[PDB]
Symmetry: D2
Subunit: 232 residues, 4 copies
């Protein structure tokens, strides 16, 4: 199966699969059952920023999510990503809706990888083109006329649909480690719009890094954030 | 056929196809017969730096080549690259040897594309990995144990072979223009090592931008820098 | 006196000092009488973006100004900035109001300088702190509680005042050229808000580069954009 | 007194002031007595690279030092730099020689600061100009004709002198934190040449961040790395 390292903005507490009992952000290391989590004060309808960062000396993966005039949620986990992930990866964004739903809109996505022996890859998407040839679009993910990436299905009045799933990987494989490396790092930012007619929107959004040929595993919908085939 | 925009470091004057009568750098716009050229004082055996730059307001494509303690060669041509190239391109490096030869070694390759409506792609290769999955290697181009990209054939004592050709494109398509754009730019740097047992080394090296599915055209060897099927 | 190279967003046609008879953008080379200009469709009240760029091989200084859903204004002038400016400079933003007025609000300011022999300086101000120790504030320029730089005077209901002038230079001197250089470039972006209760707002805004100890020259108010002591 | 956060490449074990009994790298938090250290296999005469990095979510300051074909030394310390340093700082490089000596040559210095509410400052010095107006040179630090910064005294045959001290701060104050910040980070790289006719060279080199008006404290020579007035 795929190897997944992901940072989840889980809008729906699925307490049956070990989620805390509130909307949380979390760090997922080969399982949907976050290695660590923090409580997230979700402001649905408001534009949120997420930042993710990691270097291989500190070996502490950390994320932060905020909105204008809101306090932030931060989470960190100590892990060495070379003991988890292959040397070549594809990075991407995943989202799902389930029986309950939301718009999983991405307004901007930026990413930096650095590998010293300095090699680097950077990309910055501030408006997603109508045909983004440097993206791999998986499942229901599309771009739209406002230059937004819609990870999960919406209808043409911008109403979100349920039981949906989608992802966007950067086209190019990213080299995040090698034998002779001295130090690797990456950073990642996306802005996002989560809108929902539901009291409790679902299911969330992730930034994620994976084996290069990653794909939406069978059965990974709703709570599994198009990421895992099961909640082990 | 492919659409080529290229910056040539032509080590061999092929005066039969309109090259000036000396080693030159040149700007090629859909033909090997440079739109403009300048004389290049080649120092074979020495590490050279080339820089290429362009923005769509100035609409002046310009390049500069130097070595330590050498004077530089600069060349520029006025052209609008949106009237020449498609909106999505692949960027790359090409080189050939012919009846006469050289090592076409690339020690570093870096590239920045910017598209304002800001979108950007950056990459920086300072040591080319043994299996560069973010490169498309075409013809005889390979990487080697020093972390160099060898565009054209060498033997294991580093001796160059003749009648050779190779290219390296960045894996990801680059978005260099769109309908609604305000301004696009790109920059490009490579360092290179040209070594030759011959009095007059051949044939040269280019940085080049092309239609996304570009490939070494039939018959493009030696003087045609793996770029064009003919010298029209 | 100071040596000024500036890019003007001149909201007020001062036809008595050679301005075209409409709102224009222009490139100023040691004089307020732009070396070249283009017509600018000003949308007062709307957030505008300006981009400026230059490299010393092309030797073409160019600028572009746009707003969302507006067409852009572009201008370029061929000049070698090493034959004009010293090797060490301070870069900054200037604005004035005169008998007629506007808010000269800067929402973001970013700048990149590159000097190859690669040396570089970058800065990016997206919200201007309440006490910006890396800025030199000249004349009436201040920052405000929204994290905006107000180049020219406003009152606390955001109403602009007339006969005003201000500038913001980056604290650090920027090295834009040297003897042994192969190639220098710079880029600059600011976003701005021009609001006015007047039919014809005045006087404008500039990005500018100058001798390191530059200061608001005596008499440089209104139409002289806090830049020149006279309109020669 | 100054507030110092520093990363030391301590070439001389001063076991009388709590240094481990070998050449070490270390993280100094308001004292020369490193909060944490690691053993450093010094290769005097060889060009070394040091990298330093930090973000305020992970709150783990970490450094790595290597040379070509050498294994690396890495060190990390958990600390929140907002509970230690002011909001505005100057960053710099310090070095000393003592009764024993070395050349403290810096071939390149690069630095990135990022502050999200994104503000950023970057600089990259690959050859230090003969008169670096964007540097504050303190004590014996000068630049030289090879475009190297010599932190500590050398004579004109490149022989190092003893009992010396010098520093180089970036001219501009750096904004590394504020009240409303979501996340701050910085990164820093320098390359260095330590040469010595002595069996046991002294005293070392640091990258350091400090109150904005920092200066070489009285008595801070040799083992105190021009950083602290005493070894408390
Ligand atoms: Ca969940
Ligand atoms: Ca030729
Ligand atoms: Ca005017
Ligand atoms: Ca010591
Ligand atoms: Mn969860
Ligand atoms: Mn030619
Ligand atoms: Mn004018
Ligand atoms: Mn020590």
């Amino acid at each position: 199966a795929d190897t997944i390292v992901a940072v989840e903005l889980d809008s729906y507490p699925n307490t049956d699969i070990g989620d805390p009992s509130y909307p949380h952000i979390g760090i997922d290391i080969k399982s949907v059952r976050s290695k660590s989590t923090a409580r997230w004060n979700m402001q649905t309808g408001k534009v949120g920023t997420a930042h993710i960062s990691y270097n291989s000396v500190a070996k502490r993966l950390s994320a932060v999510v905020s909105y204008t005039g809101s306090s932030s949620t931060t989470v960190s986990y100590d892990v060495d990503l070379n003991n988890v992930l292959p040397e070549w990866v594809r990075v991407g964004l995943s989202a799902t809706t389930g029986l309950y739903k939301e718009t999983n809109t991405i307004l901007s996505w930026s990413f930096t990888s650095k590998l010293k022996t300095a090699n680097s890859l950077h990309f910055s998407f501030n408006q997603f083109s109508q045909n983004p040839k440097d993206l791999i679009l998986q499942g229901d993910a599309t771009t739209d006329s406002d230059g937004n990436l819609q990870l999960t299905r919406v209808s043409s009045d911008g109403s979100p649909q349920g039981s949906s799933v989608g992802r966007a990987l950067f086209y190019a494989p990213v080299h995040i480690w090698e034998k002779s490396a001295v130090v690797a790092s990456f950073d990642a930012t996306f802005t996002f719009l989560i809108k929902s007619p539901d009291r409790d929107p679902a299911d969330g959004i992730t930034f994620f890094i994976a084996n290069t040929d990653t794909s939406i595993p069978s059965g990974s919908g709703g709570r599994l954030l198009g990421l895992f085939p099961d909640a082990n």
